[PDB]
Amino acid sequence: ATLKEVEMRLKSIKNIEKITKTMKIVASTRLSKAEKAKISAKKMDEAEQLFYKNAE
Amino acid sequence: AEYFRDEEGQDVLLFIDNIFRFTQAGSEVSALLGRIPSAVGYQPTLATDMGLLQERITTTKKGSVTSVQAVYVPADDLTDPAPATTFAHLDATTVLSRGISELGIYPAVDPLDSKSRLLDAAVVGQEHYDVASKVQETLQTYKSLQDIIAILGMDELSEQDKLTVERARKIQRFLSQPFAVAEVFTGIPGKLVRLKDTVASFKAVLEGKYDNIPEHAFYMVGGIEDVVAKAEKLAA
Amino acid sequence: PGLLGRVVDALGNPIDGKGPIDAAGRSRAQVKAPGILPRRSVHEPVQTGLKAVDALVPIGRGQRELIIGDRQTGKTAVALDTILNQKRWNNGSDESKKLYCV
């Protein structure tokens, strides 16, 4: 109604909040693995660059 | 019906339509009777009047009467007092929902909102119960995951969940059955599926012994034979 | 004492027709609540035989815990279970353990 349409919409917003919360946390977890990888990769890259730089 | 039940001593199968009209009618003449209107304008005698109708209908030693009473839920709000009062008084509720109708699933029965007094494991037999319990969980899971599929997508769900979703979509259209009286409405031959046969056929689906069948080959089928047959037809 | 095993209507007439009620008084229904001083703190267990109820929300005797919940979910079934578990304690002769359910 007013009452129910408010309530269902508010429920939607609540559920959305819950999902965005969930994602943000899961993202942090996933992010940790990602960062670890990026270090190792960048180190590997630096060796190739060592050639290219010194080579001109 | 009382005459049939009692005096003729036969069984009956009463049907009344639509009983919201019965509530509504009483509400109007209540107002005319000068009684101070009750909540949401319903008669203050609503409970007892409904009660008189329902209580009169019963299976006595004399006979047995199987009432099927239609109810119109105003604006599909069952929280409205008139459906809610009736909701208690009827033994074997069935809800026909707008959404399911809109999904193109006819019957429009809301599967997770259908409760019957006799549905107890002993009464319907353990096998029937177990099969139906699995259906209920699967569909309820599908609905809970539906929101997740909506925003996140289906790709972020568990492998088990993805298989469950696939079964649920298949089950959802496995519910569909064309009606005999909709050989006018849809012109598709009706189907009467034996109770045991339905338990068996649903069991197969749940076991996933038809996970090689596409979703539309469950739409408006009958038994197990039909699910396979419509799959073969569609395959061509 | 003798209203045990009687399904009676509100008037007091047996509607299971188990004959004239065995009763030691007729008492008014407008009778009042027990006073401040006539009460004692609740501490006597009662076990409903429902694992969740008994642990998550333990119930004692003389308690008035609500069972508020969703329409026609066989609300009465949850309640009825408590009555059934009282059979275990009831069967016994210890009158501490005899809950005479209504």
Show the tokens assigned to C50: 């429902």
Whether there are 3 or more C-beta pairs closer than 8 Å between A and C is no
Residue of B nearest to C71 (CA): B88
Strands B68-69 and B15-16: parallel
Cα→Cα distances B30→B21, B26, B33, B43, Å: 14, 6, 5, 6
Obtained via which technique? cryo-EM
**Long-range CB contacts for residues C3-6, cutoff 8 Å, separation at least 24:** C4/C100
Angle at B97 between CA B96 and CA B101, to 5 degrees: 100
Instruction: Tell me which residue of B77, B69, B75 sits closest to B94, measured CA to CA.
Output: B69
Residues in CB range of B101: below 8 A, 6 or more apart: B108
Instruction: Tell me which residue of B15, B30, B23, B14 sits closest to B72, measured CA to CA.
Output: B23
Residue of A nearest to B79 (CA): A4
SS (H, E, C) chain B: CHHHHHHHCCCCCCEECCHHHHHHHHHHHHHHHCCCCCHHHCCCCHHHHHHHHHHHCCCCCCCCCCCEECCCCHHHCCCCHHHHHHHHHCCCCCCECHHHHHCCCCCCECCCCCCCCCCCHHHHCHHHHHHHHHHHHHHHHHHHHHHHHHHCCCCCCCHHHHHHHHHHHHHHCCCCCCCHHHCCCCCCCCCCCCHHHHHHHHHHHHHCCCCCCCHHHCCCCCCHHHHHHHHHHHHC
Rounded Cα distance between B124 and B135, Å, is 15
Residues in CB range of B74: below 8 A, 6 or more apart: B20, B80, B82, B83
Distance from the A4 Cα atom to the nearest Cα atom in chain B, whole angstroms: 9
Show the tokens assigned to B145: 């995951």
Rounded Cα distance between B197 and B133, Å, is 17
CA B61 to chain CA centroid, nearest Å:
29
Distance from the B95 Cα atom to the nearest Cα atom in chain C, whole angstroms: 14
Contacts with C, B 113-132, CB within 8 Å: 115
What DSSP character marks residue C60?
E
Assigned architecture for domain B119-236: Orthogonal Bundle (1.10)
Q: Which residues of C touch B85 (CB under 8 A)?
A: none
Show the tokens assigned to B181: 């009286």
Show the tokens assigned to B48: 């007892």
Do B68 and B17 meet the contact criterion of CB atoms below 8 Å apart? no
The verdict on a CB contact (< 8 Å) between B147 and A23 is no
Do B67 and B78 meet the contact criterion of CB atoms below 8 Å apart? no
Phi, psi for C46 (deg, rounded to 5) = -150, 145
Quick one: CA torsion of B60, B62, B66, B70, rounded to 10 degrees?
Answer: -70
Do B210 and B204 meet the contact criterion of CB atoms below 8 Å apart? yes
**Long-range CB contacts for residues C93-102, cutoff 8 Å, separation at least 24:** C96/C44, C99/C46, C99/C61, C100/C4
To test the contact with chain A by mutation, choose from B78, B143, B151, B156 the residue with the greatest count of A C-beta atoms within 10 A, namely B151
Show the tokens assigned to A27: 């993202």
Other C-beta atoms lying within 10 Å of the C-beta of residue C49: 15
Residue C94 marked in a binding site: no
Rounded Cα distance between B24 and C87, Å, is 46
Residue C75 marked in a binding site: yes
Show the tokens assigned to B201: 């056929």
